[PDB]
Amino acid sequence: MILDTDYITEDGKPVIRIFKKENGEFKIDYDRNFEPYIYALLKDDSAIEDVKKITAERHGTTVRVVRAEKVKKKFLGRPIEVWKLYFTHPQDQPAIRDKIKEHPAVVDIYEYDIPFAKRYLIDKGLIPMEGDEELKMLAFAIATLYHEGEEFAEGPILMISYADEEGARVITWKNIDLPYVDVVSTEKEMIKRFLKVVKEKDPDVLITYNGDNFDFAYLKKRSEKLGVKFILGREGSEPKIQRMGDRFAVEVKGRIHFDLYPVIRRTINLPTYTLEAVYEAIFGQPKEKVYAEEIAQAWETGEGLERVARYSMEDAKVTYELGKEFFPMEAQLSRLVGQSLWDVSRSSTGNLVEWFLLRKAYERNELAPNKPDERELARRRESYAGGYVKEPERGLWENIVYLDFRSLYPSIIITHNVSPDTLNREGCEEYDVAPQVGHKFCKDFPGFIPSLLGDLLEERQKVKKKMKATIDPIEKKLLDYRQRLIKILANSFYGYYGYAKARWYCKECAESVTAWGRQYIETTIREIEEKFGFKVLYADTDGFFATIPGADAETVKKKAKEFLDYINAKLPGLLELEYEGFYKRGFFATKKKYAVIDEEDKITTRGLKMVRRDWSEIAKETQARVLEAILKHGDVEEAVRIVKEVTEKLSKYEVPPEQLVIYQPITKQLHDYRARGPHVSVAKRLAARGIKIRPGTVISYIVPKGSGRIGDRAIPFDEFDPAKHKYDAGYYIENQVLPAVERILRAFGYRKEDLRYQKTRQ
Template sequence: FATATRLPGRVHVDVYAMVNFLATIGAIRLIHYTLEDVYRHVLGKEKPDFEMGGIARAWEKGGEELKRLLEYSLSDAQATLELGQVFLPLFRELTKLVGQTLFDVTRMTPGQLVEWLLVREAFGWGELVPPRPKREELDERMEETYVGAYVMEPKRGLHENLVAFDFRSLYPSIIVSHNIDPSTLNCDCCGPEEATVVPELGYRFCRKRKGFVPSILERLIERRAELKKELKRLKPGTPEYLELDSRQMALKIVSNSFYGMFGYAGARWYSKECAESITSLGRHYIHQTIARAEREGMEVVYADTDGLYCKMGEKSRGEILRFLEEVNRELPGVMELELEGFYPRGVFITKKRYALIDEEGRLIVKGLEFVRRDWAAVAKRTQQEVLDAILREGSPKKAAEVIKRVVRELQQGRVDLQDLVIYTQLKMPIESYRAIGPHVVAAKKLRQKGYPVEPGAMIAYVEVKGPGSISDRATPVEDFDPERMEYDANYYIEHQVLPAVMRIMEVLGYREEDLRSPGGEQTKLGRFF
């Protein structure tokens, strides 16, 4: 807020701040958050690009280069306007919901939205708004810790015939169903048999008097359910549909942020007891569901926070739906276990790292390298092809052949330059870096040639053969000359391609030496029997 530009008589809406907010809540997930990438992802359109180092030259030279620069600058403004028009309805609904200005709401965190909603509602409920913590109290709160969600160590490897379940809005539904609120904690009106007793912790929550926070949250959940019913009666894409969809999304964003508000040390309604009670109850219900699924003959291969993946075995889809009904019959309040979907195959590596293919042929990838921004395209593309071979065709052998082919192409110098470029953002002034990584060295080389290099710049570089460390050999893509330079194939094999795929291939019984050699084969012990 302190650095935001304020314009008298105008509301300054920052599209970058909107994108940052949507990325924070997981509504947009990209490798790079450049204007070009967001524009392509959200609207499916392309816009002209222009080399950072050529701007000054084009301005001085004029002619066609200046015309191209002006077209690029105009496209920046046009793309920003179009993205703003897409995002504005959602933020307008958030503004109406929490009762703050559009300028402020577009720059808030999800937790701040919750807090301002509660401040707005407090007067009508006769609630006293708690003060913000002072420095000493804030420091004490920040030292407090508690156990979070349950994440099961997956059964590593390739699995087939999977079904996934997840709890609908697990933490919000726990808050409402168990009346989690600072004012209902360890109340005097309920005895031990009457109150909700939190597993592992022993905290008690009142069942006779509804708390302020769960009352507000319940109203949001109910209103969103009503809107979703209305949406089913409307034609997607119509103005009325888009307006209601923005409204239900605003309700979802705020509802899902209540738990985080309880656990944030700077929040007015901060309560460690409430936050850890929510996660304790979450662990209780996911453990309960895992045990029940296994009693029913399903094999649980992975579980994380509010969902689980099971091998169906001999069970029919009808039996899966009956299992779901039985679980939901016993859940309290507004809690509900939902069927997320059926998956023909999935490969599970470690906690938070897995990939599946759904019945429509779409890949769902969590925690694997090709979503990171500091990997060259050759590594991302290879990992994508490996996952396609494993999940679409069920063929680890074909995945190994893909890797060997890419290794050969790198060794033979047959990989295009654009597939070798590594992009890393400069997060501070060059002089502030103590650890001098490859992107910092590349940035220094750019500055020496007169290019403007500032914090926030995306540095694009290639690793070339030659003396010195990996950092020393980082060459800005603008300086790469194929006539006198050669990319370092060994670097791309050992530090890009193999690291991007080995986590996947290891759980399938392959070793690095099997994949470096064109003739290498899987050498798992079982091959010898």
């Protein structure tokens, strides 16, 4: 299989290098004949004589057009003849493309900003990560000596740990007596030993957790200080640190540096992305965190260094385990997009779609449209109508089914041939007209993007069938992320039509997809209510919750399956409504906010959690009891007795002050805050008192009754005393308990006045 491609320059000419692993052997193949080029559309063919003579400069070197070739291509399916302008070196292109575009005889230029190594993979039809080749993997982590107020990598690396299928080891330059610890004389010998381990093991994949921004840069500064050639690359090169957006990315030539951080960050939704939080979220097992301040104290005092070495060993061990689980998903994405694993694992969804389209356009002899200029970008900022969100039905409902369209927007694109090359194309025998917006789409030939979505949907469904049939819950969770990645990718082709920077931008296509979606959902709602006696409780874009008011579970399931057979027979092409779930009870508060309970007693809440906001244990506990009373017990009157009980106890000062602690994290330096909330106000006072506040510190505070605003009175819970200080009962009622439970009890007709304590007169 092909792992990656790049290019080097030999005598001013580029040489493509293809990094491969074939039959367990690493190989580098060289192509010295592939030439860079761009296209030019001219107003007249005779002007090519003047265009061939255009020159530019590139550090003393005169840049010239090597040769030209008139080629017949297509632009949005319409034939167009352009001139393929060849160059000696890819860096000639940025130096001369503006001068060629500015020539009076040149109407426009195309495919001028495609990186040379990626252009090679596309033009040669090569796809990375193909085949039954087994890759050797090795994860690594570093433990460093940190002291606040110091420059980056000023302190030494204390330990370098690594892990693979054979186990995990730690290299350190202090005498720690553990079986997996290798003790060396100095930091220099430790780095040299790690470099030796990677050369001996010769891994195809180097796994890190944030190695793109921390591990490699730290190793680089330490190697520069110690005079060590950190030759990790298979061709003797050192790691190549490049700028990627607002951060950095690191390559190790001949190997795949798989940094798990960007992959995990876009795959799983978590409040924190520490290696410990990621490991527990995936494997359901805890990982102990040993902080930087503890590592430094253990090193300087010599005490408890076994705990630091164990923490370091487990960093490498869990990074290897996480790498094993997430690599198959990324390797499949590399095959789909047709680009290296290093690229697809770090690139945005917009870039994945664009790289996939550039390849398919090449296969189909289609000229790629250019990225918009500043003027065109300003023209593409207008929005369009999206999905339909029904206002939910107030009240408690029983025996509810959730029906949802399978891959709605991609199925609409395939069925109705929604593409920029089919939009208002004259001369066709057949058209599909988008409702409301009226855009017409030619149906005589498959459109560019519609013809490509089918295979993605087929691939996703194969993964879903594998998933539902998986015994292992970890493997099933990873297959769930895999099918969801393809689901998000397929939907991003729709989004891409309305994305201002898209090459194949088509706002008409985007608003037609949403218009057809709005038509299908509203028609389906009308159909289930009028033909089958269902009541649609709530709907959002392509799915809805419905029930037959006076019917048992067996009847509602039976009639939902009858409706699905009926509606699926009426729906055209790839459009299909699926049975997604059954819920015993369910309440629908507002749009995007509701809670449902399945037959196994599992509650699913959407828009109700709101965990980023500041919540007290009393508000969390009250909302938990309210939802338990409504969904589990089916008793709305009990839920309102709980809220009235809590507000009465808060007013009477009967609630233990332990339930009033608000915990919220400090996420940056205290000086870097724009707005000062209660948690920041407490933290600034604690910092002034000598307490070390750092990003990650949780502030546990309580609001007392007093003079100033919330943050002014707010104090740490370690300073509160119920025998001296009276808590702010009104705050816990009006700002914590009531806002959280009112949004739920709105559905049953209860307002804030009904939830508050009686205040009876004597």
